[PDB]
Write a protein that binds this ligand. Structure first.
Ligand SMILES: Nc1ncnc2c1ncn2[C@@H]1O[C@H](COP(=O)(O)OP(=O)(O)O)[C@@H](O)[C@H]1O
Ligand code: VO4
Ligand SMILES: [Mg+2]
Length: 759
């Protein structure tokens, strides 16, 4: 009988064991009567007998191992079924094209009120299950969407919000919650090499409900907008979409008023890719004077979803749908164009004269446009960017320092604009009180590149905490409940990642605190910071020096120029240059005073050793989020990126297997095969049917009424198990378990009626 054996790029391959030896197996790959190869015994797995079949729940497999899990998800993917369960946890493999109709209004309605198992695996079923648990358990809910960059977290987050608003919404508040997202994507999403539409901030979106489970409003929390991208990008990346939507789609009147032109004309865009997303037809809708030479030569960027011209139109519709007037819209655009012009203010050395620098003569217009759009005096701005009062005098800044002042001001203005946008979105659906919420979490996903800096460190830190919460809720607490209730479920061990979080966040000697301490030294040094990190974490399993990397490009990074963190999702080598200055969130007073005293009302509203730790601010925000998550029932969607090329129909087995392992899903499948995802207490069950019980039943102890109710309901006893205080149901029995929990008086009387008859 055929088995699964290792394969370097497919993960596993199918063959037959043809001989066995001391500590190995000899495998003959299917249809290769010649060749054999050797495999360790613990690396060969039994395979499903039918290789073309799939099951909707991986718990239903004959053999439950990492190789069968991989293959089952693959067979489904090959048939455009991107969703599969492991009990009540959803696995979602990015298709990288739009599969027709699977998100239609019709499909939405078909999922309404259905139990897990009675419809195909779908994100819609996860959302419905959260709404039902909310209602029945009287308990706010959270849906955690996880995965690496480009796995599909954001698309799925939008499917959940759409499902919930369409299904349980009022029937104009809905739409508003949905249209908020494309609006925030404009300001906080950008092309990176992993994702054409990468989220460069984390979000938690809360749909709030009253006592009768009707939507009363929403609330969007936002976490750590990436700042450095505002000013510079790698050549295959872009700044936030809004810059290119505006350049591509603005009317000529708007382009004139804001002095826009093709993206190559702005420093804050032109180190990056200056090409638009467009297809053959949308290209023709963009005026020639918006196109860069790079665009004219190389043509447009292709994407199934993004279209800068078409996305500008949609973003303006979305603004009008949530209630921004044309004045608010133009204000947003003006500040955006002001940031652009700000970045064109360039500096040349003037050491022999002032000892500092002057503006380059060519930057004259930029200074003018910037000052006009930001309502500042040209001279005030000139002076704030080229000089600074210090300790007493007023000293001329060097060229490098003026650049930093220019960029720090640009980062803060744009950051405050983004903050204003998110707040404006919460204003479009406020509420004074609510009973529960369903929150959906969508973070920036695990990412690494040839060069990794502070941005990737913060982002991967946030993925680390999330994975830990999954471990806590699913692998730890679940096993603690089985034990506490005496179920004798075989313990499953796993590698935990709390040590990685400690390395980062522990008091005084965590990376975040060591970095903070560096910012407060007289001579802050990235090198000094990094040495201290290595020194205080000797032999720590999650830390290494860069030269131990598996990649050659890292071989020449000195010990004090970076470190490797061994994240749950994999080793990442960070280069520490700029960590110190990137960790400071504080804007110097001169620049703050400059922008707070703008002539423009709107800009004033943006703003209502100086050092504010970005790292510890972020930590504090995430711990509060986690406290909120712990106070809820949690559902999990694990997104999987099938390949490194953004193509459809290219399942990379080894890449996918690696993510199934790192996400803990192989461990979960192991625990679940003999676990009990559904349960409720004997007493609460009894107490709920009590008032409908004739005396013959009421007299039974709670436990024995349950046995009667289950036996009357045709329920087989392989399918459940009585613990100390709770009864537990196995995977595949969600429908049967939901019928038992149904609290509808007609339903309760009907089941009691069935028990009476059964006696
Ligand atoms: N279910 C899906 N259907 C169609 N396209 C998808 C789906 N999920 C992801 N994609 C594509 O993959 C890209 C990346 O998805 P996204 O949700 O932005 O990833 P993440 O947020 O996890 O980094 C999307 O912009 C879209 O093109
Ligand atoms: O590419 V992502 O939206 O995980 O940041
Ligand atoms: Mg996203």
């Amino acid at each position: 009988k055929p088995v699964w054996a290792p394969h370097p790029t497919d993960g596993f391959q199918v063959g037959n064991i043809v001989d066995i030896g001391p500590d190995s197996l000899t495998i003959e790959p299917l249809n290769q009567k010649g060749k054999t190869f050797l495999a360790l015994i613990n690396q060969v797995f039994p395979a499903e007998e039918d290789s073309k079949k799939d099951v909707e729940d991986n718990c239903s497999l004959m053999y439950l191992n990492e190789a069968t899990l991989l293959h089952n998800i693959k067979v489904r993917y090959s048939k455009d079924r991107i969703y599969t369960y492991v009990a009540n946890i959803l696995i979602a493999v990015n298709p990288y094209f739009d599969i027709p109709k699977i998100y239609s209004s019709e499909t939405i309605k078909s999922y309404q009120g259905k139990s897990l198992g009675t419809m195909p695996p779908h994100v819609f079923a996860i959302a419905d299950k959260a709404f039902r648990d909310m209602k029945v358990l009287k308990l706010s809910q959270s849906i955690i969407v996880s995965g690496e960059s480009g796995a599909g977290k954001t698309e799925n987050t939008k499917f959940v919000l759409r499902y919930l608003t369409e299904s349980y919404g009022t029937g104009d508040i809905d739409d508003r919650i949905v249209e908020a997202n494309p609006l925030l994507e404009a300001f906080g999403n950008a092309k990176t090499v992993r994702n054409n539409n990468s989220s460069r901030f984390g979000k938690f979106v809360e749909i709030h409900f009253n006592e009768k489970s009707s939507v009363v409003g929403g609330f969007v929390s936002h976490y750590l907008l990436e700042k450095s991208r505002i000013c510079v990008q790698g050549k295959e990346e872009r700044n936030y979409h809004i810059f290119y939507r505006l350049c591509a789609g603005a009317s000529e009147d708007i382009r004139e008023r804001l002095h826009l032109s093709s993206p190559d004309n702005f420093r804050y865009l032109n180190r990056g890719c200056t090409r638009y997303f467009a297809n053959k037809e949308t290209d023709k809708q963009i005026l020639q004077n918006r196109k860069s030479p790079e665009y004219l030569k190389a043509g447009s960027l292709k994407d199934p979803l993004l279209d800068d011209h078409g996305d500008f139109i949609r973003m303006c519709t979305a603004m009008k749908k949530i209630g921004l007037d044309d004045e608010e819209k133009l204000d947003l655009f003006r500040v955006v164009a002001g940031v652009l012009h700000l970045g064109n203010i360039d500096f040349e050395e003037a050491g022999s004269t002032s000892g500092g620098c002057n503006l380059k003569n060519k930057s004259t217009q930029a200074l003018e446009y910037c000052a006009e759009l930001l309502g500042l005096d040209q001279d005030d701005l000139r002076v704030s960017l080229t000089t600074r009062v210090m300790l007493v005098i007023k000293v001329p800044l060097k060229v490098e320092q003026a650049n930093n002042a220019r960029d720090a001001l640009a980062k803060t203005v744009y950051s405050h604009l983004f903050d204003h946008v998110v707040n404006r979105v919460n204003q479009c659906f406020p509420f004074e009180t609510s009973s529960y919420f369903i929150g959906v979490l969508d973070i920036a996903g695990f990412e690494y590149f040839e060069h990794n800096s502070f941005e990737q460190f913060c982002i991967n830190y946030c993925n680390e905490k999330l994975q830990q919460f999954f471990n806590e809720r699913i692998l730890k607490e679940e096993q603690e409940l089985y034990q506490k209730e005496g179920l004798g479920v075989n313990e499953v061990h796993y590698v935990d990642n709390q040590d990685c979080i400690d390395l980062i966040e522990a008091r005084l000697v965590g990376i975040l605190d060591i970095l903070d301490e560096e910012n407060r030294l007289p001579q802050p040094s990235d090198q000094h910071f990094t040495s201290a990190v290595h020194q205080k974490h000797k032999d720590h399993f999650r830390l290494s020096i860069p030269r131990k990397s598996k990649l050659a490009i890292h071989r020449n990074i000195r010990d004090d120029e970076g470190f490797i963190i061994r994240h749950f999702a994999g080793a990442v080598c960070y280069e520490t240059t700029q960590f110190v200055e990137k960790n400071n969130d504080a804007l110097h007073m001169s620049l703050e005073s400059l922008i707070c005293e703008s002539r423009d009302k709107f800009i004033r509203e943006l703003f209502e050793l100086s050092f504010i730790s970005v790292g510890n601010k972020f930590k504090t925000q995430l711990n509060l989020l986690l406290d909120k998550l712990r106070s809820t029932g949690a559902s999990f969607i694990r997104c999987i990126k099938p390949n490194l090329k953004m193509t459809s129909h290219h399942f990379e087995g080894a890449q996918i297997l690696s993510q199934l392992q790192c996400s803990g899903m192989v461990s979960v499948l192991d625990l679940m095969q003999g676990g009990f995802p559904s349960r409720a207490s004997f007493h609460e069950l009894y107490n709920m049917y009590k008032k409908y019980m004739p005396d013959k039943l009421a007299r039974l102890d709670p436990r024995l009424f349950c046995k009667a109710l289950f036996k009357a309901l045709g329920l087989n006893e392989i399918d459940y198990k009585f613990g100390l205080t709770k009864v537990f149901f196995r995977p595949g029995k969600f429908a049967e378990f939901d019928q038992i929990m149904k609290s509808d008086p007609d339903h309760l009387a009907e089941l009691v009626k069935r028990v009476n008859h059964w006696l």
